[PDB]
Write a protein that holds these residues in place. Structure first.
Motif, PDB file in Angstrom:
ATOM      1  N   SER A 247      30.351  14.659 -12.128  1.00 48.17           N
ATOM      2  CA  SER A 247      29.407  14.729 -13.239  1.00 48.17           C
ATOM      3  C   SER A 247      28.576  13.446 -13.360  1.00 48.17           C
ATOM      4  CB  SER A 247      30.131  15.047 -14.554  1.00 48.17           C
ATOM      5  OG  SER A 247      31.163  14.122 -14.831  1.00 48.17           O
ATOM      6  N   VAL A 248      29.182  12.300 -13.069  1.00 47.56           N
ATOM      7  CA  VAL A 248      28.481  11.025 -13.173  1.00 47.56           C
ATOM      8  C   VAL A 248      27.731  10.727 -11.873  1.00 47.56           C
ATOM      9  CG1 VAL A 248      28.753   8.525 -13.541  1.00 47.56           C
ATOM     10  CG2 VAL A 248      30.150  10.168 -14.900  1.00 47.56           C
ATOM     11  N   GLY A 249      28.297  11.142 -10.743  1.00 50.79           N
ATOM     12  CA  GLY A 249      27.662  10.957  -9.451  1.00 50.79           C
ATOM     13  C   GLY A 249      28.277   9.856  -8.607  1.00 50.79           C
ATOM     14  N   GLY A 250      29.554   9.568  -8.814  1.00 51.02           N
ATOM     15  CA  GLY A 250      30.253   8.627  -7.969  1.00 51.02           C
ATOM     16  C   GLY A 250      31.501   8.108  -8.639  1.00 51.02           C
ATOM     17  N   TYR A 251      32.046   7.058  -8.051  1.00 48.12           N
ATOM     18  CA  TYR A 251      33.227   6.410  -8.585  1.00 48.12           C
ATOM     19  C   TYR A 251      32.926   5.668  -9.879  1.00 48.12           C
ATOM     20  CZ  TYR A 251      36.189   7.355  -4.535  1.00 48.12           C
ATOM     21  OH  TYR A 251      36.961   7.959  -3.558  1.00 48.12           O
ATOM     22  N   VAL A 252      33.812   5.901 -10.841  1.00 51.79           N
ATOM     23  CA  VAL A 252      33.836   5.216 -12.114  1.00 51.79           C
ATOM     24  C   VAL A 252      35.214   4.604 -12.306  1.00 51.79           C
ATOM     25  CG1 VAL A 252      32.072   6.674 -13.168  1.00 51.79           C
ATOM     26  CG2 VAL A 252      34.511   7.311 -13.376  1.00 51.79           C
ATOM     27  N   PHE A 253      35.298   3.634 -13.198  1.00 51.82           N
ATOM     28  CA  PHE A 253      36.557   2.953 -13.436  1.00 51.82           C
ATOM     29  C   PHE A 253      36.621   2.508 -14.886  1.00 51.82           C
ATOM     30  CE2 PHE A 253      35.183  -1.422 -13.751  1.00 51.82           C
ATOM     31  CZ  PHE A 253      33.918  -1.385 -13.183  1.00 51.82           C
ATOM     32  N   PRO A 254      37.834   2.261 -15.397  1.00 49.31           N
ATOM     33  CA  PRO A 254      37.923   1.827 -16.792  1.00 49.31           C
ATOM     34  C   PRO A 254      37.264   0.474 -16.969  1.00 49.31           C
ATOM     35  CG  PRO A 254      40.053   2.573 -15.993  1.00 49.31           C
ATOM     36  CD  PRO A 254      39.161   2.448 -14.794  1.00 49.31           C
ATOM     37  N   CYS A 255      36.432   0.338 -17.994  1.00 48.17           N
ATOM     38  CA  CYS A 255      35.772  -0.935 -18.203  1.00 48.17           C
ATOM     39  C   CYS A 255      36.751  -2.078 -18.488  1.00 48.17           C
ATOM     40  CB  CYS A 255      34.715  -0.836 -19.303  1.00 48.17           C
ATOM     41  SG  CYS A 255      33.296   0.260 -18.923  1.00 48.17           S
ATOM     42  N   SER A 256      37.993  -1.743 -18.839  1.00 47.66           N
ATOM     43  CA  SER A 256      39.034  -2.753 -19.032  1.00 47.66           C
ATOM     44  C   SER A 256      39.628  -3.323 -17.737  1.00 47.66           C
ATOM     45  CB  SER A 256      40.162  -2.179 -19.897  1.00 47.66           C
ATOM     46  OG  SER A 256      40.779  -1.058 -19.279  1.00 47.66           O
ATOM     47  N   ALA A 257      39.263  -2.762 -16.591  1.00 45.55           N
ATOM     48  CA  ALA A 257      39.826  -3.199 -15.318  1.00 45.55           C
ATOM     49  C   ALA A 257      39.302  -4.548 -14.856  1.00 45.55           C
ATOM     50  CB  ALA A 257      39.534  -2.166 -14.233  1.00 45.55           C
ATOM     51  N   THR A 258      40.122  -5.231 -14.070  1.00 54.96           N
ATOM     52  CA  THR A 258      39.674  -6.361 -13.267  1.00 54.96           C
ATOM     53  C   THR A 258      39.550  -5.864 -11.830  1.00 54.96           C
ATOM     54  OG1 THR A 258      40.841  -7.955 -14.677  1.00 54.96           O
ATOM     55  CG2 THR A 258      40.227  -8.704 -12.472  1.00 54.96           C
ATOM     56  N   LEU A 259      38.355  -5.942 -11.258  1.00 55.55           N
ATOM     57  CA  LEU A 259      38.107  -5.392  -9.928  1.00 55.55           C
ATOM     58  C   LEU A 259      38.538  -6.355  -8.831  1.00 55.55           C
ATOM     59  CD1 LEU A 259      34.583  -3.811 -10.412  1.00 55.55           C
ATOM     60  CD2 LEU A 259      36.774  -2.674 -10.537  1.00 55.55           C
ATOM     61  N   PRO A 260      39.132  -5.820  -7.751  1.00 49.38           N
ATOM     62  CA  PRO A 260      39.413  -6.660  -6.582  1.00 49.38           C
ATOM     63  C   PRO A 260      38.130  -6.971  -5.813  1.00 49.38           C
ATOM     64  CG  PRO A 260      40.034  -4.403  -6.134  1.00 49.38           C
ATOM     65  CD  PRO A 260      39.594  -4.436  -7.564  1.00 49.38           C
ATOM     66  N   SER A 261      38.179  -8.045  -5.042  1.00 48.69           N
ATOM     67  CA  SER A 261      37.101  -8.338  -4.119  1.00 48.69           C
ATOM     68  C   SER A 261      37.077  -7.317  -2.969  1.00 48.69           C
ATOM     69  CB  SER A 261      37.257  -9.747  -3.563  1.00 48.69           C
ATOM     70  OG  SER A 261      38.434  -9.868  -2.783  1.00 48.69           O
ATOM     71  N   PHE A 262      35.985  -7.350  -2.203  1.00 47.32           N
ATOM     72  CA  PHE A 262      35.840  -6.543  -1.001  1.00 47.32           C
ATOM     73  C   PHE A 262      35.275  -7.436   0.083  1.00 47.32           C
ATOM     74  CE2 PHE A 262      33.703  -3.781   1.977  1.00 47.32           C
ATOM     75  CZ  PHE A 262      34.593  -2.733   2.120  1.00 47.32           C
ATOM     76  N   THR A 263      35.948  -7.467   1.234  1.00 42.72           N
ATOM     77  CA  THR A 263      35.514  -8.287   2.360  1.00 42.72           C
ATOM     78  C   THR A 263      34.955  -7.400   3.453  1.00 42.72           C
ATOM     79  OG1 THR A 263      37.300  -9.877   1.929  1.00 42.72           O
ATOM     80  CG2 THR A 263      36.324  -9.920   4.100  1.00 42.72           C
ATOM     81  N   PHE A 264      33.831  -7.795   4.041  1.00 44.60           N
ATOM     82  CA  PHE A 264      33.334  -7.119   5.235  1.00 44.60           C
ATOM     83  C   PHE A 264      33.207  -8.091   6.397  1.00 44.60           C
ATOM     84  CE2 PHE A 264      28.779  -8.271   5.192  1.00 44.60           C
ATOM     85  CZ  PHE A 264      28.524  -8.525   3.860  1.00 44.60           C
ATOM     86  N   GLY A 265      33.405  -7.575   7.600  1.00 51.73           N
ATOM     87  CA  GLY A 265      33.338  -8.381   8.801  1.00 51.73           C
ATOM     88  C   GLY A 265      31.965  -8.447   9.421  1.00 51.73           C
ATOM     89  N   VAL A 266      31.621  -9.641   9.897  1.00 51.50           N
ATOM     90  CA  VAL A 266      30.424  -9.861  10.692  1.00 51.50           C
ATOM     91  C   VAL A 266      30.938 -10.592  11.929  1.00 51.50           C
ATOM     92  CG1 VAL A 266      28.130 -10.865  10.837  1.00 51.50           C
ATOM     93  CG2 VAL A 266      29.003 -10.080   8.616  1.00 51.50           C
ATOM     94  N   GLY A 267      31.066  -9.896  13.055  1.00 51.50           N
ATOM     95  CA  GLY A 267      31.773 -10.480  14.172  1.00 51.50           C
ATOM     96  C   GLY A 267      33.147 -10.943  13.714  1.00 51.50           C
ATOM     97  N   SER A 268      33.524 -12.161  14.086  1.00 59.00           N
ATOM     98  CA  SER A 268      34.803 -12.717  13.659  1.00 59.00           C
ATOM     99  C   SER A 268      34.738 -13.367  12.269  1.00 59.00           C
ATOM    100  CB  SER A 268      35.300 -13.736  14.682  1.00 59.00           C
ATOM    101  OG  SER A 268      34.384 -14.799  14.778  1.00 59.00           O
ATOM    102  N   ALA A 269      33.557 -13.390  11.666  1.00 55.14           N
ATOM    103  CA  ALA A 269      33.379 -13.962  10.340  1.00 55.14           C
ATOM    104  C   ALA A 269      33.633 -12.917   9.249  1.00 55.14           C
ATOM    105  CB  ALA A 269      31.976 -14.538  10.197  1.00 55.14           C
ATOM    106  N   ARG A 270      33.764 -13.401   8.022  1.00 53.94           N
ATOM    107  CA  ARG A 270      34.097 -12.550   6.894  1.00 53.94           C
ATOM    108  C   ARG A 270      33.224 -12.936   5.716  1.00 53.94           C
ATOM    109  NH1 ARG A 270      35.995 -10.477  10.822  1.00 53.94           N
ATOM    110  NH2 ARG A 270      38.223 -10.419  11.366  1.00 53.94           N
TER     111      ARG A 270
END
Ligand SMILES: NCCCCCCC(=O)O
Length: 330
Positions: A247-270
């Motif tokens: 109904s909203v069009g994607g992932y939603v989460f409780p506004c009370s949450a603390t979100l984790p980081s997200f890491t992506f790789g670029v070659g051997s770098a992060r």
């Protein structure tokens, strides 16, 4: 030559960024959305259907002594979010951050879709993908960067987007004071006209890094980070109460949450995207459901490293004969 211009979020969520651009003689300054995912420089103008203009600054070619109609040329574009615009074409002098191109194709909108009208802060787009995507017919036109390239000290531009803060687009040089550590360069495919590259994997929060190839595009004109459903599910599984809402069009989460980081790789770098960058706030005013900044690319047909990802890095768009993309932490 070089250019340097500040880019500023349009709102408190960093939904997009605007950069002042001087068009014509005397200069008409319009605030454009620099978009590495498209290849048209188009503007609201004196030709735009009046009912479709609501607060934007317009380009008036008749007031520019250097404007010339590009006779017979028309353009029409549709973007991935369903928005669109179309019109005719002038050539004129365009300057960004002190870097001037003469004879730039300035695509004058006759029509724009509702989402453009409704956003008073964006006066048009300045495309920075490859010129093969330019929509002008019958004679395809070059982007501002492609026109500038030969004059530039180095055939590059850089994107340094801020989190809830202004940032910078530079042309023709790499500001070695603007990043930490070293820049990791990675191969680009131009086959689809985009700055398309392959990330080497991801991690969620303090979790272990998953080595896996993720092909996607570096797209300053897309707000969010769109990745395969497997990756996005693994991220949101670490947030209590998060769910995908049709109904909203994607992932939603409780506004009370603390979100984790997200890491992506670029070659051997992060590159680490802090959790706060992934919070796009209440889905509607006063709601305790918040919209996520990492969403599934399923159904788009391509993965998109949009602003959520790019703002975590200093990003080099290297337009040499063999193009590459560089990422550094900052
Ligand atoms: N590569 C991004 C394409 C869409 C940009 C739309 C920007 C806007 O609504 O002003």
């Amino acid at each position: 030559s070089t250019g340097s211009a500040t880019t500023t979020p349009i709102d408190s969520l960093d939904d997009a960024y605007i950069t002042p651009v001087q068009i014509g003689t005397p200069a008409q300054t319009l605030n454009l959305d620099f978009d590495t995912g498209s290849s048209d420089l188009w503007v609201f103008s004196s030709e735009t259907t009046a009912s479709e203009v609501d607060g934007q600054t317009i380009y008036t070619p008749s007031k520019s002594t250097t404007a010339k109609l590009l006779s017979g040329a028309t353009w029409s574009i549709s973007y991935g979010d369903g928005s669109s615009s179309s019109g005719d074409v002038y050539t004129d002098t365009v300057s960004v951050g002190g870097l001037t191109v003469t004879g730039q194709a300035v695509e004058s909108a006759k029509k724009v879709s509702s989402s453009f009208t409704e956003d008073s802060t964006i006066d048009g787009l300045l495309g920075l993908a490859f010129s093969t995507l330019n929509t002008v017919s019958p004679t395809q036109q070059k982007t501002f960067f492609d026109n500038a390239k030969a004059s530039l000290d180095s055939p590059v531009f850089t994107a340094d987007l801020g989190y809830h803060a202004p940032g910078t687009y530079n042309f023709g040089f790499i500001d070695t004071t603007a990043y930490t550590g070293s820049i990791t360069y990675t191969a680009v495919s131009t086959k689809q006209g985009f700055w398309e590259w392959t990330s080497t994997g991801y991690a969620v929060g303090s979790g272990t890094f998953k080595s896996t190839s993720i092909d996607g595009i570096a797209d300053t004109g897309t707000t969010l980070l769109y990745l395969p459903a497997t990756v996005v599910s693994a991220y949101w599984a670490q947030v209590s109460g998060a769910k995908s809402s049709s109904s909203v069009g994607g992932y939603v989460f409780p506004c009370s949450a603390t979100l984790p980081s997200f890491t992506f790789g670029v070659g051997s770098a992060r590159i680490v995207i802090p959790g706060d960058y992934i919070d796009f706030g209440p889905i509607s005013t006063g709601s305790s459901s918040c919209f996520g900044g990492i969403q599934s690319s399923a159904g788009i047909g391509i993965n998109i490293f949009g602003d959520v990802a790019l703002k975590a890095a200093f990003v080099v768009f290297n337009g040499a004969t063999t193009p590459t993309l560089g990422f550094a932490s900052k």
